[PDB]
Structures are given as C-alpha cells and as structure tokens.
C-alpha cells in the first residue's frame, strides 16, 4: 500500500587491509538503509551467491536486487540461483543515470570505518587475519546501529 | 535478468496557464524516462485513476508506482483501483531521503516547456481553453522525442 519496496543494491569493493579475503561484497537495503557485508577471496558467481544467502538470512527475501553488469552478476549460475529464490534481477536506469549511488556511498563509509577501527587497534597496514572477522562485524554494527 | 524494473513516479503540479484544468498529473517511467501528462480540474482519487488509465494505454502496465502520501493517492478508492490492476503502490525511502526527484525535475521541465511554447504563440498569460490540449501534447512530445 504505502511503504518502500524491498529492493537491494549489491556491489563488490576491494579492501587490501582485509587480505587475503579482501573482496568485500556489500548490500544496501534501499527500504531500510541497512548494510550487510561479507568478505571473499575472489569475485566469482559463487561468492556473490554466498553473500546473498547471508543477506537473506539477515534481512529477509527482497523483491529485486540491482547490480552492475559484472560477470559474477550476469552469469548463468547467478541467473539460476536468483531464479531459484524467486528474486528479480535488475540494473541501472538509462538516460545518463550515473551509478547506483547508495551502495557506492556505503562502500566508502565502510572502508573509512574499517580504517578508523583498525588504526585504533594499532593496525596501520593489513589487519591480522584472526582479527578481521570481528572488526568487519564491528564496522557493520557501527554503520547500522547506534 | 538485466534491465531496469518498470516503476513509475507520479505527482500533481499546479499550472495556472492551463486553467480551468490547471492540475497537471505527471508520470515519469524510471525505466525509460518517458513522461506522460494529463490535465485535470481537481486533484481527486478519480483524477489520479484517469491519469493512470491513460499512462497505462501509452506505456504499458508498470510493476509499481511511487507517489507521496497525498490523499488522492492513499484513499480506499485508489488503493482498490491499483489492486484491481495488480500494480504495487509504494513511497519514498527513509533515511532522510528528500523527495522522488525525477518526477520533480519533470514537473519543472514541463512547466518551462509550456511557458516557452505559449509565449511563442503569443499567450503571455492563460492559454485559451481551445488551444490547451494541443499545446500540452506538443510539450509532452518535446520532452520525450527528438
Ligand atoms: C525506483 C526509483 O525511483 N529508483 C530511482 C529513483 C531515483 S530519484 O532521482 O527519483 O530519486 C534515481 C534512481 C537512480 C538509479 S541509478 O541509475 O543511478 O542506479 C536507479 C534508480 O532505481 C533510481
Ligand atoms: C530502486 C532504487 O535503487 N531506488 C532508488 C535509488 C537511489 S540511488 O541513490 O541509489 O541512485 C535513490 C533513491 C531515492 C528515492 S527517494 O526517497 O528520493 O524517493 C527512491 C528510490 O527508489 C531511490
């Protein structure tokens, strides 16, 4: 009736501080502005599917997901995984519309937050591998809850 | 698979040059950036329904329509007309999201175009009632086709 539709925007961003799993998949729920992030070793169709399985457990099942035309997003595999879930897959709108901004602003806020927290803990370079998960979870908490 | 979802934004704007039917209903198709406009004497639930019946004949049936919470848009009547068509009705997204900009930019472009054309025809004030329809159709053509 009157309330925003459940549409996500998803993207991958590189963050070397999180190596070897430095590919962060980030999903913004445009209905709630909630942010979900997971880390991956590579940007593959399967990484994107694992990320969305996690996002679905946390946010529920969306009506549609917007991405760019990255191959992990347009592969037969990913097309079939989304069909299996009954989730529509869409993309940017034409007419010189420059970029799904929200997930892009999120990428930036996220990388800043990771940096601030890391440097606070005394990691000026790569975050030790055993510390990464809690730090990523803490940045996600900070970006969503207050 | 990969292409933009069929979501419209609809709004009413007042344009005294078009009196007595000075309420212009404007619909932008975010998938194609096409603009549909009709004129009305009042902003009622029925005016909104007549506008969308026209927009559907011209653009096809959308998956959802975004409006503000104006009463012509949230009435039981309009809620039922949209249900009858199987069209979802939604609204702005939270998080300090200030306004469905696209249909708002359209309103502005439309009123400018009407002014330019009217003054070109020598109407510096109200457009004579018998001339209004073709002039409105000409502004719509100008905003969409080239
Ligand atoms: C459903 C809907 O209205 N979506 C949208 C509304 C507006 S707005 O300017 O009107 O706020 C802008 C949008 C921009 C893009 S993108 O091409 O940059 O990715 C995609 C959308 O889906 C947009
Ligand atoms: C489906 C989708 O992505 N929609 C959208 C994408 C973006 S964008 O900044 O990411 O381009 C901005 C949007 C803004 C609004 S509104 O509150 O101003 O009306 C509504 C949308 O629906 C938007």
Curated annotation (Swiss-Prot), chains A, B:
Cofactor note: Binds 8 Mg(2+) ions per integrase homotetramer. Zn(2+) can also be a cofactor for the nicking activity, but not for the polynucleotidyltransferase activity.
Cofactor(s) of this protein: Mg(2+); Mn(2+)
Annotated Mg(2+) 3 binding sites: 11, 68, 104
Boundaries of every Integrase catalytic domain copy: 1-146
Function description: Catalyzes viral DNA integration into the host chromosome, by performing a series of DNA cutting and joining reactions. This recombination event is an essential step in the viral replication cycle. Has a strong preference for using the 3'-OH at the viral DNA end as a nucleophile.
The record's note on its domains: The core domain contains the D-x(n)-D-x(35)-E motif, named for the phylogenetically conserved glutamic acid and aspartic acid residues and the invariant 35 amino acid spacing between the second and third acidic residues. Each acidic residue of the D,D(35)E motif is independently essential for the 3'-processing and strand transfer activities of purified integrase protein.
Quaternary structure and partners: Homodimer; further associates as a homooctamer.
Name of the protein this chain belongs to: Integrase
Species classification: Viruses, Riboviria, Pararnavirae, Artverviricota, Revtraviricetes
Gene of this entry: gag-pol
Section of the entire sequence shown: 1334 to 1479 of 1603
